[PDB]
C-alpha cells in the first residue's frame, strides 16, 4: 500500500528520428510531511526516549 501512498510514477514516449524511446519517472515524497494521510512508512517504530530520574529520598509529603 505505501506504493499507492508515496511513489508517483509516469511513462512518456519521446518520438525521435531513428526510433521512439520511453521515459519512466518515479519520485517518492517524504512521508514525514504527508499533510493528509499516514505520516510514515508502516515500518516505522519510534521508541520514546526515557527520562533520567533521581529516585531515593525517604518518604515525605507536601501540603496544599
Partner RNA sequence: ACCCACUCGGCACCUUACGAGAAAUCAAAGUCUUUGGGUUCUGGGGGGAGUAUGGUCGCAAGGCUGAAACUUAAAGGAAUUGACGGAAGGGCACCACCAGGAGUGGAGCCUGCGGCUUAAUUUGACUCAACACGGGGAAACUCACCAGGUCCAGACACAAUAAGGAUUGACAGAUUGAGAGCUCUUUCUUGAUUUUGUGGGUGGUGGUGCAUGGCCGUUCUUAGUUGGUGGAGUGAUUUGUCUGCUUAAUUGCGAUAACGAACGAGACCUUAACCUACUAAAUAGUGGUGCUAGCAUUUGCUGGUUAUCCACUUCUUAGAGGGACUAUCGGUUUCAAGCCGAUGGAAGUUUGAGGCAAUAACAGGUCUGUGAUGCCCUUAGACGUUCUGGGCCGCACGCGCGCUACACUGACGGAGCCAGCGAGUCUAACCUUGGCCGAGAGGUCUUGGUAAUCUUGUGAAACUCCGUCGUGCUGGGGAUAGAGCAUUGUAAUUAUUGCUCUUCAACGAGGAAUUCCUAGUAAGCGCAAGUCAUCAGCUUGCGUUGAUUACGUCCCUGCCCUUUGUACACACC
The piece of 15-23, 27-35, 48-56 that touches RNA (CB under 7 A) is: 15-23
28 near RNA, rule: CB under 7 A:
no
To RNA, the closest distance from the beta carbon of 40 in angstroms equals 10
22 near RNA, rule: CB under 7 A:
yes
How remote is the C-alpha of 16 from its chain's centroid?
39
- Give me the residues that bind RNA (CB under 7 A), please: 1-3, 11, 13, 15, 17-22, 24, 41-43
Amino acid at each position: 500500500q505505501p506504493v499507492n501512498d508515496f511513489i508517483d510514477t509516469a511513462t512518456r514516449h519521446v518520438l525521435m528520428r531513428q526510433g521512439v524511446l520511453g521515459i519512466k519517472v518515479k519520485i517518492m515524497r517524504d512521508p514525514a510531511k504527508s499533510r493528509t494521510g499516514p505520516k510514515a512508512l508502516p515500518d516505522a517504530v519510534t521508541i520514546i526516549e526515557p527520562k533520567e530520574e533521581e529516585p531515593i529520598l525517604a518518604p515525605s509529603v507536601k501540603d496544599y
